Amino acid sequence: NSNICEVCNKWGRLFCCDTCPRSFHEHCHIPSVEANKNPWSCIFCRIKTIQERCPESQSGHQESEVLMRQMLPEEQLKCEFLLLKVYCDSKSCFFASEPYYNREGSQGPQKPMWLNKVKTSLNEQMYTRVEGFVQDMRLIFHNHKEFYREDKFTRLGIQVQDIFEKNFRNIFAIQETS
Ligand SMILES: [Zn+2]
Ligand SMILES: [Zn+2]
Ligand SMILES: [Zn+2]
User: Fold this and answer.
1) Could you name the CATH architecture of 1-59?
2) How far lies 47's CA from each of 51, 68, 78, 80, in Å?
3) 60-178, superfamily in CATH?
4) How far is the CA of 156 from the centre of ligand 3 (A)?
5) Residue extents of the structural domains in the chain
6) Most buried one in 2, 128, 153, 157, CB count within 10 A?
7) Rounded to whole angstroms, how far apart are CA atoms 58 and 170?
């Protein structure tokens, strides 16, 4: 097994996956690493199993159809993994915790959003469709672009949104386009 957390790339109190060499801090894994279960398989292994059990799940899909899916166990897992993939980028630190807004010439967003709030929402099964989760994720970056206007700090929102969108297209097998 790896000697650092797959998500935050630090050592510490790590839980090791039984089916692959990754390790995690307890609350870096999503969902949080389970109390018992031997063997234990991480989210990366669980996602790979879904794909192996249904190879056709990798054929291209339309985003509009994906968004309307109900949050059954397999969609719930895919959204958890997509969230995890965003936390894996070190620039996610800017969007993890609850933001505040006091900048000359700007007004804060009507509906603030941040990654830890999305993490809680997933954990508490508040989203009924994939759409709910994706809308909250995209709102994080949209609020950031709008608030920071022409400051170069806006680019952090562009960068992290690109990681989200690439991972979304991969995990949910969105049909490739020009
Ligand atoms: Zn970690
Ligand atoms: Zn694993
Ligand atoms: Zn099948």
Assistant:
1) 2-Layer Sandwich (3.30)
2) 7, 20, 7, 10
3) Bromodomain-like (1.20.920.10)
4) 39
5) 1-59, 60-178
6) 157
7) 9
